[model samples]
Target: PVDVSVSIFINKIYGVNTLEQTYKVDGYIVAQWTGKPRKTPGDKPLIVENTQIERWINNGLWVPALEFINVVGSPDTGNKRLMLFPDGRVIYNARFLGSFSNDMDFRLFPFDRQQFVLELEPFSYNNQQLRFSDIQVYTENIDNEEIDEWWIRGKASTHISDIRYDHLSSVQPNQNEFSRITVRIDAVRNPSYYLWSFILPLGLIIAASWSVFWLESFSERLQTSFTLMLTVVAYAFYTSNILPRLPYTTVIDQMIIAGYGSIFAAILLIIFAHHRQANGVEDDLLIQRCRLAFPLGFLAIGCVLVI
Candidate 1:
């Protein structure tokens, strides 16, 4: 049995597309295995680079293709090399840029934490033929995260498992089990942009909406309520442009919905106050003074929403 040691060096990670649910990974895949002892040019290994690797493979080089199980498409390989050692060791190295898919959880939106992952498995061979003991490294440092939009959480987690391939009911699978390795890097979304650009303005809009109750006359209150309602729409469109699409609502979505409800509640209160209390011709002091209680109630209910 031939044992392979996979050295995965993650050099750069970017292109975290929330709407598309894909991420780009740039790295080098280095694999080493021992074949048969042979006389080389010297103690130094025989170096084969780039196009020469294909020729060596045709000349009976024992190298197998390792597939990215979660890759969005075929990877764009940039460079290739092979090292032939006198002690029967062979190392196949390549640089690749690949797009991978993962289960995204954006339920908290700007405040969410997500894990970017990669999976590796043999394209054809199974565990009985090739065994894997992959080593992995990530260049991200915990303290350097302030410079980017995502902060990698400490060191990444790695695991190697035996994956069983199952087909139709008529298939008898003895060597269908394969060695698969999965690596994960957890990340935190930077919240500064959302806090200053999105949530701040949304808070103002909701608070100013409470001022609609302070109008001196019933006509003034009615007009300003619609104005407040219009502003929420403007904020919503701005929000939609910035936030990624999700099947469920984010925290910002919940805020905009509450803002709309606050305005509607004021509208209903104004109608009920004028029709039942006012003599149909006169204005009452208590009827138009709801400005004091509305914001207090708004704040109280908002706290409830947070919890």
Candidate 2:
């Protein structure tokens, strides 16, 4: 084995396929050392394949693997190789493949923030013996790295020290201490995909829903608004079908509901103003006052909403 020094580099990371319950990691491992680099019997580095990695997974081993259970395209692996060092440091260099994940919601069209995380620890066998030991890892924020294609916006609360894995492992009788490196990347919502897929389409439907009030006839106004209400419902179902479900409503969902409510409320007021008086005259002052009041009321509601 050729002596070498190695380090793992994570480049662009994204494409969390929720259907397959897997996320994709794109990066490469770097192996370098003082010795002369030469071609070996196996040109490719000996990869710790998924099965072996799964063995570690079962044993509660933390080996970061590229996970793309439902990814559309094949991942790129930049020049993979391995280098052995005369010293204890052994470099395992290869294109990294991992499916890291966090809870996601896609209801908000055009923008969504999701946490990309990796659970890292020393291989189970080594980690189990050193329970309670902790190591401080120096991490540099690579968000500003311009050469990379992906625009990484932010990062989350990082704890690089050490953690105790309470989850017991059969191989090790005692509690294990694994040097844990939690790499968290907070990516801004990729606006391109959501804009076309969700935002623009939904906006059209919502805008159309507002036209229900334009009808002169009472039956037309009321009946049309009901259809518009169903339109919102259909849009909601469509949004839910394409996006990940979350416990709370997102900005897009809120806007959709608001569109429906605005139309429904308008229809109700128009009918009340026309019928809630003698001679179909404008006796109800509340309806006229509501026209100006709605804007200010909506503004106040919006202000309080942010809080």
Candidate 3:
């Protein structure tokens, strides 16, 4: 089995597609393997660059295709280089930009953590024929954490593993397993924009919704709750326009729902107080004084959402 050592240098990570869970990557791959040596000048390696790399392949030079398992389609590859040495060592280097995909759940919205991954394995070769011996990863974008939308934590965690698929027949076991190199890039959302722009105003809205109980007249309190419901619905429209579209609700969505809930709950108390009175017109004295109760309960449930 040929042992391959792989290294990846990531220079750019951008253009995250939320719905498809696809992201753009700009990087280069380096794979080194030792094989029979060829005649060379000064015993130094012969360099084959770009188009000539394929020319050498047509001339019967053995080159293995390391396929990206997670990549969406054919990548836009750049310069391809093949370095051949008289000492039986060959290195294949190529620059590439591709869209890679994975499963992602953004239910937490602004506080979500994302893991971008890359998977590489031989196109036709299996673990018994070719194996990934080791892998190293490096990055140039971590310094842009503050300026970037996604703050890359560090160089990705790189590892080599053996992956297996279901056997085609009872006779085929070795054909199922392949050696793979996986790189995981963990990133955190820079939530400054969301916290201030969306959540803070939402906090204010929820707090103010509780103030419907502050009105002494029952009709006035009931009227204020109706307008608060309108406010929440309008904010929902505004939030949906700006945020990434998702199938399920997020933290912000839940907050908006709770805002409506607080208003509806207050509205129920407001009506029950007026109707439960002696003539079904005058308000109940004790129920109106529960102004502090509404605010404190709303706050308590707000804290419950964190867990």
lDDT of 2 by residue, 1-307 (tens): 2222223456655565654445676665454434334343454533444234445357653323322323334545555433433433334456756565555555543455555665554444334332212222222345544222235664434454445556655655665545455556665555675567666776676556555544556777777778777777777776665446566677667767676777777777877767877766655565557545665665566478546
lDDT scores of the candidates, listed in order = 0.82, 0.53, 0.82
Give the worst 10-residue stretch by lDDT in candidate 1.
138-147
Residue 50 alpha-carbon offset, candidate 2, angstroms: 14
Candidate 2 to truth, TM? 0.61
Candidate 3 lDDT, 105-138, residue by residue in tens? 7878888788889899997777777888998887
Error of 1 at 50 (Å): 1.8
Ten consecutive residues with minimal summed lDDT in candidate 3?
A: 140-149
Provide TM-scores for the models.
0.91, 0.61, 0.89
Using TM-score, rank the candidates from best to worst. Answer: 1, 3, 2
Model 2 weakest 10-residue run by lDDT = 130-139
* Candidate 2 lDDT: 0.53
List candidate 3 stretches off by more than 4 Å.
Answer: 143-147, 167-173, 216-220, 241-249, 278-282
Instruction: Name the candidate that leads on TM-score.
Output: 1
Tens-digit per-residue lDDT, 275-295, candidate 1: 874457765567656677777
